[PDB]
Amino acid sequence: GELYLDCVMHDLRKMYSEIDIKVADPVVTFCETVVETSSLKCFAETPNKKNKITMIAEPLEKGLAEDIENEVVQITWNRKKLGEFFQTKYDWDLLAARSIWAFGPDATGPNILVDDTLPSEVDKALLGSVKDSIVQGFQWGTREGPLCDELIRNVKFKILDAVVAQEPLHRGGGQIIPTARRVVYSAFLMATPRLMEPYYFVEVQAPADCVSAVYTVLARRRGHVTQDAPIPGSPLYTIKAFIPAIDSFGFETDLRTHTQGQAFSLSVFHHWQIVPGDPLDKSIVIRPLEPQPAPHLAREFMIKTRRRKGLSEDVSISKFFDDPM
Amino acid sequence: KHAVQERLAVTVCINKIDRLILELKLPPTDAYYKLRHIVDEVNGLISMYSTDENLILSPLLGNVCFSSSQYSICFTLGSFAKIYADTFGDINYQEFAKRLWGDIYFNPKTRKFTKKAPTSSSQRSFVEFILEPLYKILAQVVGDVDTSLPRTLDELGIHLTKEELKLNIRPLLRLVCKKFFGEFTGFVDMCVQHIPSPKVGAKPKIEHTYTGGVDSDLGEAMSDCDPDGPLMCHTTKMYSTDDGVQFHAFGRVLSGTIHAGQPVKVLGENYTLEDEEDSQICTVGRLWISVA
Amino acid sequence: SPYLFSCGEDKQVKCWDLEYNKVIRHYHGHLSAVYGLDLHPTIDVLVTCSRDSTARIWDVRTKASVHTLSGHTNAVATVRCQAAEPQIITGSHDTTIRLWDLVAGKTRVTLTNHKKSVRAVVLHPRHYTFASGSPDNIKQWKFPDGSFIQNLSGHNAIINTLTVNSDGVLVSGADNGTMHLWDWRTGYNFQRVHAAVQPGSLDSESGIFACAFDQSESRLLTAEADKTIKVYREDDTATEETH
Amino acid sequence: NTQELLDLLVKCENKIQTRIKIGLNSKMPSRFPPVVFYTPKELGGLGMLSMGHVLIPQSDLRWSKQTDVGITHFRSGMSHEEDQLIPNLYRYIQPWESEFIDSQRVWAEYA
Amino acid sequence: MYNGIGLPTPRGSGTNGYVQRNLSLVRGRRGERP
């Protein structure tokens, strides 16, 4: 939070290295996801020109995204039993439920794989299905984000068809992992990708006399006030609300200034939500200053981290993701 | 939530009841309503993740002790019926102590702690034997420091001399209820009731913190020092020294002992997949325990 | 003490504190320019010599003149002081040395020699026997009562400085650039070194105004009129032998 | 456009305002009003061409050195706010590109 | 400073200070009172 990073920076400056240190404007780690499924199917190439893994990526539901995010399923279980878990929970298909392998980031992050939407037998020969090259290749290729080097989350990829090398000791057996990476998020970026900002749950306690001031100072910062609760005991009482972590900067100071020190708030990480806008958009004019309250602050919010440590812009799917021959 | 996710022993010491009653100035029955509400809310909040459905908390289980750290009072009834006992009681507490919460006492027929109100305005036993006498100590010391305070000191049997009675009203309060309540007996009896006093609750602990290790590490981590086991001691924290550049790490010992400069096999977060990629084994002959 | 002292012709004597690099005492009372100063090595006073005729005992911590040593008739070019009696030695521009009582203030013994003025005295610091400097005939004395031990050879410029090392070598620095090494024991003029000027200065501007050995006494470093500090060292040979 | 010069004119005009006031041994706020200076000599008085009462502009000081930002937060220039509104000198001086566009058409019409 | 700017030396220059706000700005939403 703010105060944690304050005490970090104080101990960094005046205790552990007494050289003067420039800081930057605070900004959040933010995340990537998809909104609906694909509108085209992917394509592959290896240096042997041997593979063709064509596939898609579709969303999940947010509750099970939290579930696999919070170790509700574990990889140590029985294959049929975790299949039964996801089967009887998400009313999933029976043949595809047991077909899974290890999950997304850290094998815990909700970017799971299902091999078997489209029919059960193609190859199964030596690799033939995703065992170590594509699993660890996805691990190596899901922590480094596709669209603006920020992680995907709550988007699952399902392989539709593929092929093995003739003898992957001789031909490509370690030369399909970067193709696997490239294919998976090629299928991601064609599917209308979106970003996710974190929200903070904020709990205010505040006297009743200055309680519309907190409505104004979080409503200005895009805050959905959920619960105003007169509490027993304290005449001051609680507000519970949601604010973006990019608009939480100087929050409790602003709140505590407008209420002349009577109100007080605390702030904690809630689950991620969708920024108003699309990263893929072009013909979209971003003034350098003047923050957007607009429905297109997401394009700003991603180009201004590609303008950072970043990459080059213009992420339309022609060059590194696809091949219009 | 993070504690029962680690299934630790969730006991509770709710605090600032002086701030409940010197400051919000609640009548005793409504103070009981607030405390019953807050214990019911933490009970219904613990029973949101019901792997331990039997485990609830109440004062009668010796599971919650009230307090005021401003004036240093321990409270709870298993320790308070001791102060009923050592002066003028001969009560034989912990059956009397587990009887005063949520049931109504009445003065004739000398005791039947009913489920009903004998008189149409009958305060409970918690707001006739324990809470409202605390009100009378507290209100008579911060309202009547000149009159009626030697009467309540003569009744409570606390002599207190001319120098220490000339204090300001807040330190005088802290001293008078410190000499009344004595020592923190409620906080240690709340820990006889729970907090499983290790090698007894060590099984979910060593299960959750270690990765398995049955027949190699599990049975010896369940054991104590008795110096035949491994060393195998955890370390989560790293305090600074006064000069700052020296760090002193800090953690719990589970089965073993360190004396005088033992070579120390320092594991790491990903140094040991099955074996140490690095240790940099250390020789440390100073280590000592911490207070504030 | 952790502070240095300074004095110059602005009539000012200052106590530069070294922990802050700033003036803290700023002594006052000299009626003309201020030439030399020296610290008593044991107690905390400060003896200063001027152009008017006098020398003063400033009390450090009080910045109060304990004594004005009024016994000369012209400028007082230099002053050294020590722990053993006699305490203070003032060599002046009226051709005389005199040796003072630090307590009573009166002079113990004046030393009339030196047809031309004395401008440098130095003490040894192992045994007794200080030595004085003048254009005629650099001499050498002996501390209780003053006693003419010896005069030294013909270093015949108007000399400015004397410095002595703990192993008996002694450097006399003069106003025409020439500086003569000696020994304490005999009086044998040893080296007779005359240095050059650094490019801008004209030929007749070499002259030595200060010389001081190191605490190691391996380095002899002289402040000269050529706006230059010259730093000297030994030489590790054997065959420059005595005649 | 030169903001650093508009700070200088406010700084220098007030300094000769003050230099005349210390010649009277005055320096006082209302013992020497700005009627005295800005009244033309034909009535009497000193008669001086103001550029200080101008409301010198500002911008965001963080982002000032970075980028042409625009304009915010007019800073008050000379210390006179009672609604006298002494005229600038700049509005009686015909600007340059207007003067050259007059020059082109006037010599064209004259030929 | 409400937010950002002013003058660190009010006694250097021949002014009193008091930055206003630029009342001639053009945008969509600014206010706090109505």
Add this chain to the structure above:
Amino acid sequence: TYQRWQFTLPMMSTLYRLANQLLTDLVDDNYFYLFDLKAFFTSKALNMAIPGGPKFEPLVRDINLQDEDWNEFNDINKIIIRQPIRTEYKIAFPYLYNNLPHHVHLTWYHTPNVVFIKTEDPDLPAFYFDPLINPISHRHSVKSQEPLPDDDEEFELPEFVEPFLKDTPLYTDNTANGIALLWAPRPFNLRSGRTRRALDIPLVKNWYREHCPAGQPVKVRV
């Protein structure tokens, strides 16, 4: 010599009643967030100002310098501005919002917000300005111990079966204003102390250490 004084609580509660009209109703140092002395020390050290606070002169940290490639590499019109960094944020905690701070002090953080119902009526625990969501007269959802009023009288010795007090009530005339005086300002929560000089006591001094009430002229706020 008139050096020391000890009063009694009626004698001081009447003085505390008489000494209004120049005594502040602030119960805690929570009105003074970013009007504290340490917030002002930080504002002095950082050349900036809280609105309505003092404006000092800069100190030895006058002019900074960064060459063009370096501050151009760190800071372009690249960063995600959402809402501006006000100076109250920098004075609040001057380390992550402010590069190179020194000679700087670090302010207090949220004293625990005393509520303290004030009184106008007898019967001390009047229980007002306070909701209560706990359902009265009908509740059980947890198991209680001793759910069996069965054991008759054996161990409640009637010599001291009684509570710790019944000889005096839980309230009287001078326990309302006593606990009102418990939360008093600085001279009036004492009951005892020393004697101050008559010029030592600042009267109009909690007054300026506040905000200015709005609707006041420019002369009185400067």
Add this chain to the structure above:
RNA sequence: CGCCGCC
């Protein structure tokens, strides 16, 4: 967000 006051 409001310098200034002279022997």
Add this chain to the structure above:
RNA sequence: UCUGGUUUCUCUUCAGAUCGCAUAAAUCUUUCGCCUUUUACUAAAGAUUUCCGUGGAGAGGAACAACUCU
């Protein structure tokens, strides 16, 4: 049954404390700002004092000290 002292006045060193729940003036050393030169000045930093006061300590009385803490 015996033990048995608060005020008030003068001296006697120690002060490490918001010695003071507030807060003066000076000197020095630098940077400011007005400035023509010098004192009157400006308003920041550093280090020093003076001054208006206080705290604990030895002694001498006198003040009901014989009321009585003990």
